[model samples]
Target: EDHIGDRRRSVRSLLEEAFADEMEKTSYDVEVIAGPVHDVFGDAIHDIFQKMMKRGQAVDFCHWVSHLIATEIDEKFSEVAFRDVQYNPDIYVTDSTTEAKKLFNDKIWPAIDKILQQNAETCPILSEKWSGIHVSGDQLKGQRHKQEDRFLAYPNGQYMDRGEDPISVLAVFDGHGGHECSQYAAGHLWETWLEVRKSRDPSDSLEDQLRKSLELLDERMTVRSVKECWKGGSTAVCCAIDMDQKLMALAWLGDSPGYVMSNIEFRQLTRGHSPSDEREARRVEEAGGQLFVIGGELRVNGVLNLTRALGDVPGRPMISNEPETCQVPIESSDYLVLLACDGISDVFNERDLYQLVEAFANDYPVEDYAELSRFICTKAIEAGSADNVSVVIGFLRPPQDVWKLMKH
Candidate 1:
């Protein structure tokens, strides 16, 4: 009861504060319009005027008016504030790289296979035509020292057949402080994506499912971390290709991005969620934060490096968990899909990637997407992508078809 009384008083005070200034501004107009009746009706008019005030203001409201209204609203409605709105599920962590690798092979792979089987059983299109490839790659970089980047690809092989229900997933993870978070995300993100996809209506558009799934993943990350302990986090980029439908969907949580090459032109599918993004940087500065970048040590707000990521308990605010997604239809003229970490994007921008794709498309046989992937890594080294560089180039067509008439 006391709290309710306090809120009513606050709202009344805020209304008076706003009305006093507004009345002062319109005093002359009121007098001119009301004539002799203005004085007698002034108090009555003010009391009656309460009924005319809208619950919210228009854009041109004065700063103080806006501030006071916001303050009162907060005070009155603060109890309804979101608490643990973001829920991160329990994350199973392993002790070492070996253990993590085994978890992927034994646990994650089986879970994915089960989901695929379930989808096949229930969806006629998936049961008859859907097929996928799971490819894993690990590359070691740096001389006299060893650092590695690990990746996984789940490209829908049915796309080669122009079959229904096509989707592909590509992920890259960068480990800082420790490899647990990166390894965990690399191994489990596909499963998490699939889990979220299962809950949506089958008839839902792919774009909608992709967006909802990414948000669920973000919320799950927040909830999961509260139950586990980890200091590191990973940036992720995921792409879903629906070739029969000629559409592709992408969602990114950090600097990692998806790229597309078509008709000798290259375009990036995702943008970096970093302090470089103006609004985010300004928010940090307003909160008395600083950014630092020196000799490859990148820190935003003097703490986090990547402005978007998953599973950094202490770094969630600095890192955006909201997914950025877009859909692009594929054309027969489309060349390939490229997925890479900041290690590669930081060195080679769009133009650079196009030139490389064009060079390979012209010179090498169609079966050379793997070779192109290696070429990208070599160039990234040449261009000083000092961090561990990982690249996966997915050729749209099957190797057998491209090599059918060739002499060995």
Candidate 2:
């Protein structure tokens, strides 16, 4: 009924379409729930649902019908049934269905909801900088079926500006309260960057442009309405490059990290805003939030894990969205620029990443930058990362670049 090719679609419509698709796919599988209800208890129930569509009773039947379906799944699949229901909450339309909410409270809300959350989190679906723009993306739901990470990138079609150059914006969002805030920030925040810069003095420092744009957005984000409903948020680390100027700037709010690699040395571009860092610890404590360790990892407020992030409605006044900012001069020698969620970093350290790059390029490197990135992701997962893993790599190649910028 609804299409999601355009990301501008509303959350409700996305869910409706997603759920409708889910039901459509499994509806005929109802023979599993049949036993006494005909060859399809599933089919029979949906038959009523469509009929109710004409009479406008579809909404009422939604909860009940979903309940029956979920129940059938729980009974048939058993054990992992709840896990099955919880898969992919990003695209999942659970709350709208009374059946799902009832089941959530019946199980996920208490048993699963508290533990499974996404406060942390891209690949191109962009082809500008490459005759072979290598884009490799992978997501691990970790221990939960819900994936908290979302990647952000646009092809040259969307990325090329009306102006004279291309802007390369790459971001990794580690969501805390949930992906909604991250989702909002990644797409809208970057769009805001575009508009904010365009309207500002083009002569302004890149760092200032990045800092102010993000701060302005954070200030406006907590309008009491948006903060009220979507209580989740994201911690972001991003690299914005002025392809025309050959300049790059890095910025971040929390633990998600960014890096630059050249000449066998890997340098961290963004600092993780987490309690593990003494500065962030002091800031969080000064803000009246407590800190301690849980499950071997440092956490802010002994509850939240990041000292700074996009949103955490209840934790706020304590958590901040203000990103720490820095800039870099991109040279031809700069081999690769990367941004990734904590998941990949959780496994690979600075040196570890350096060696991995060496290995990819050393052993049997193939095709493009994506080969190395995909290898890195596979390694992180193999090393036992228990969170969503998303990685983005920008290869600053001379002959072929994502921006295809040239000097006069």
Candidate 3:
């Protein structure tokens, strides 16, 4: 018999040991499928392995055996009968056997497969094309008189596969004073980014390129703000996924945050640049500014709430335009990437937001994954966020795969 943790272990060997251990038992509860049949199944496994393995047929061994056990239980016993032996003292090789094959197939695989087959009718898992990307954005003016949020779901870029550039984009801008700054940043941030890329050093890092582009954008916007006497300033967050390099770069200024969801876990990629933080407060103070509490909220120099943003004509030397940036590996476990304004962040923290997003995803069909932005914005407003709300959600892989991965 194969050892439990051996490199070349067989399911048949594990089953043989389990059956031998159970042979000394005096009693059986609901004895639906008993000993001789267990040996029979072992013989069947031996022959199948001989034929398939000798023939060099590609097989997912554990997954195949799991199906075999699931089918056996589904054919012979009720759910209650399976539950009896699932944790019995002498039934299976390890708890993993019963937990994986019996629990998963009985509870999940059937239902999820049914939905993908019947409702969606477009299971990409059936083909080699199991990966793709989708980007969507939505915004709302909650209690604000005018919407000052802007976002881009650009699905076209020079350095990405066709129809998969959603990950290449994806930014959200939150305007503080008025809409002009946010609007300008949203409309032209990508243009400025590409322009920087055109003349960038080939060895330059993504963070460096993002910093240069953001500074140039702020410089241009500062000129406009000074000439037109514009008092509006905007926070920006941007993300770009390079498939060829297998890296996802996030760049941002101010409170608008970037989030990444991988295998049911939520990660906040960008930290907010608010005066409420001691680090930001000290930075502002060092730059000849003072933190003042107005209306019970901390603000920089008694005017701007954030320590960094794009366009405020007189905000220079105090409100910095430098963006914090990072690059994370584009891992297979990555499911969704989201960018949002501060309104949504104000209502929910990271874990709470994960639960909300997971609940919504589980309740709806995958086709509506693109509309998650709208749903999230609506929920933020419902949660009493009295600010402009906006979100851009990027589906990094097929939603069905996300469900299966999470379920497992």
Candidate 4:
């Protein structure tokens, strides 16, 4: 009773006497939800959005509005919740790397497998008529939270495009400071992207729409404000595929990254948007923010080592919401699209990732998407990645799926 009040709560007693179930689930509480969001702008919202529209960046404006909605609707900024469970490394302190790997896997791998199972579907893949599809993902918590990292494949986990040949979306989020923001965005961003695209001119390019959507995602955190204090935020790398068009649109903020693996050729898709990027560093300088080195790494105002992320209202525009985006045509030769956070990336740069992957696969020849994902997470920890590790793998037309898609 105390939790929910007035959102269209008109004639509540009379309605309770009629459609109680429907009434209970919903209300006319526009002011309750929309009020706070509406109150925040103080001209900032309209001002920013107007500029976007006037400048012919309507897609950016649309995403900004959605971000406002998500911020108000989800309370990621309005509140915080920490899980009671803590993954203290007490047990692995004395163990060797191999022993620690096995122990960590024993405790967490089953849970990851469950999530992967829950995320997989073959019906949508078949419907899309794509040779076939494999959506495999896994998470590893290395000195990390209740696993704030998240991955998703849309359209019933199969993420297919029954309309445009076929399409698949894959993404990874690395939550910083906390899980509230990352978890919220991971659960909501894709749906929001779809909705925005549906409202846009079909002629609008997927790449531009994606760029807008990513910024809108970051704006969700600005609902709340602070100074000199950072509690919750996230970095995301999202990839969407238009199967028929052979187009892959990638958008990202912060350091979570994406790569395409083909033969001995591993190419990065999303540029790392951290203080490491010269353009990002210059942007900070233009913002009147200072930059310097810490532990031999560049950070904005000597605080965040990353130039962009979701949330961090205290840091606000200095941290940036805009994500760099690109649309590239993919070839069948591309074996997989891999995306992950620095936890794994630090260990597996363009140089050695394939070697590490193949070597691990040689030892355990399951060689399936799920197994590959699990191996990546566990081995990253063994390789001394001390942060949470999450991996998303899009098996680009595995042999069976290729055979099925090309059966004609």
Candidate 5:
């Protein structure tokens, strides 16, 4: 057995010692599988080891063995005794012709085979390995109008390209009053940004491009909503990576924010333009209402929800509609970039995500960026975030020079 901790004591030493005292009272043979059996056990052990490593924790051999035994017993008993335990026999049984229809069903064969096939394709205890650079995220509606937001990244030109830089842009927009604003913003934000990029010289600063793009989005949404007589408004955060320049840019309106984690610290890359901002707070007070931070809710004029957004017919006067852009010089120190709506930010602080990513960054075999994003949303729900939640996580690898250090 490999020693997991720094003490250099083998896991088998602890297991054998624990069983040594218990086996004196039992007649069961404690077989130590080796060779071919060892090979299978080695694979299983490696799988478990990899998963535990990704979590930055070593597996407790005793706890693992106990869990394995309990799982095996429960599964075996379930198959044999609980096959027809449920009272709805008709629903459970696919065919009514057989005498043992209650015991088995036509659906059981395919379901079981599918489960086995899926299990065969994946190692349950370990993560799969991959090499492609990836970005993923989602968003939810937190204390505001309900909305679901998501974004995905693939190889540049994998989706669409008009000979622009091989860079890709992904974003999530949270709507306040109705889907009209969010839908409009989501649909046109990226295209508008691309259009602005086309007009600029290739040597133009990306920061200027990002600021102009967001300003254009704000103008378009405001004009469209007012002219169209729609009572809709939304907040947006956009992230773009210049693959050629190794530069990253982020822009946001309203409370939506962006974060980056590296060097064991979580850095907030974007500030929330909520009613909590001094200027918005002052405007809310002047509107014959008071800004309140009761419990956790940040309220403006005691009514308006968002303090910065693209369009809000009634609440537009109380909020700042400008976009804030942040330009970061990409380097090996930057490991991950996250963009999320207030849904996720409301429930999680900067430190919460830092710990989450740092736990997985050390030794994970698979790039679990999607799973990490989903886990944050799941946690938000558990923490009582009632609105739709969305988040995006982008993993950044240090340039190739960093990889060579591991060889020696």
Candidate 6:
């Protein structure tokens, strides 16, 4: 209760700080140029807070307003300067007005934006539900002879009613040697998670719950592998989100990765467990496993390219089933939760992926998130990735709304 109260107070002051910071940077005359500048932004900020404060949409709201303010000032100031030079040619220099416009666009606009983003980071989490979220999953066989990648988005009714808030679970699995393990996991991981959560103590943190669930799933896969004499293994990236609480918990094994994108900011949520990773390599070596480069790719036991997986019954003690876990706040500014096999990451680095998504959103309509996922898979194949590609995207806001905010 007090946390929400504190956030409310801080948001108002954050608004004041934005205005105060902008006012302090004034070098031009106050009434003629600076006055209208502040008046335009001040009203914009005021209107934004009036609607968005309840959801703690500070940073997200501020970014859109900043774009609008930039556009508005570009026109409003040009008119003001034209009138100034027309009436008072002796007092105003044309070059001075040009210089002021350059400074505002090049420096002051970004400065104000930075201040709002920094201040918004200090605000407490609010209790708004993520009702607008849209999730989609897709996969392609790529150049592989057999389809080995699989993905799932669960509770077709949207979410489970196990807690006060509905919980949405999504996962991506990449299989090697064979597709059985990935297929089995894609079919059963969520059900297993629900059973485990219900059977366990309610006091368990979401991170603990996810870790335990993954471990249990790994055990099941190992048993199946032994019974069927299978040498297959699979990497996984799984996330569970509490819709009302706006909290997300992610767990992973092997090279499948996950990310949270908050507007232009890109945050990696999971690290791949590969022999090239120092800690993974150290752990594998410590477990008496050989690490070597095969065809320019780091491999464990001169066979598996990664140091962790779900099955791999023969690779036990070196290749692990223990999952790394993380809990992230689903802030309003955050629009996407992305999980994919290494197929995509192998082709596009983080910045490249962000730019691709940004450009796609700008150029095309994105109401069909399934199409967006398919597009990513197709792009990865086109970029020379030979492995099976799979992707799961959780859109926190409608793509149209996000693009509108992003527009200049």
Task: List candidate 6 stretches off by more than 4 Å.
Answer: 1-132, 155-165
Q: Please name the candidate that would achieve the greatest lDDT relative to the true structure.
A: 6
What residue pairs are clashing in model 6?
A: none
Clashes of each: 5, 9, 0, 7, 13, 0
Give the TM-scores of the predictions, in the order they appear: 0.59, 0.61, 0.64, 0.62, 0.58, 0.65
Better of 4 and 6 by TM-score: 6
Ranking by TM-score: 6, 3, 4, 2, 1, 5
Residues forming the 10-long window of minimal summed lDDT in candidate 2: 31-40
- Model 1: which residue pairs collide? 87-223, 88-220, 88-223, 88-224, 89-224
> For model 3, what is the alpha-carbon lDDT of residue 239?
84
Relative to the unseen true structure, what is the C-alpha lDDT of residue 335 in candidate 4, on a scale of 0 to 100?
Answer: 69
Models sorted by lDDT, best on top: 6, 3, 4, 2, 5, 1
lDDT of 2 by residue, 73-136 (tens): 4444333334223112133222223343233224321221121222212211111122212233
- Given candidate 1, what's the lDDT at residue 81? 19
Write down the RMSD of candidate 5 (Cα, Å).
Answer: 16.9
Q: Give candidate 2 regions above 4 Å deviation.
A: 1-138, 154-157, 160-165, 219-221, 224-228, 362-368, 398-408
For residue 1, model 3's alpha carbon misses the true position, in angstroms, by: 49
Across residues 190-229, which tens digit of lDDT does each residue of candidate 6 receive? 4457656667786887778778888877765565566567
* Pairs with backbone N, CA or C atoms under 3 Å apart (clashes), candidate 4: 7-28, 7-29, 8-28, 8-29, 131-401, 131-405, 161-167
Per residue, candidate 4 scores C-alpha lDDT tens digits across 166-280 of: 4566778888777756765664565457545766787778787677667655554354323224476888888876666787889888898899877655688888887777898
* Tens digits of per-residue lDDT for model 5, 314-339: 67566667677888887777777777
**Model 3 residue 2 lDDT?**
24
Model 6: what TM-score?
A: 0.65
What's the alpha carbon RMSD for model 4? Answer: 17.6
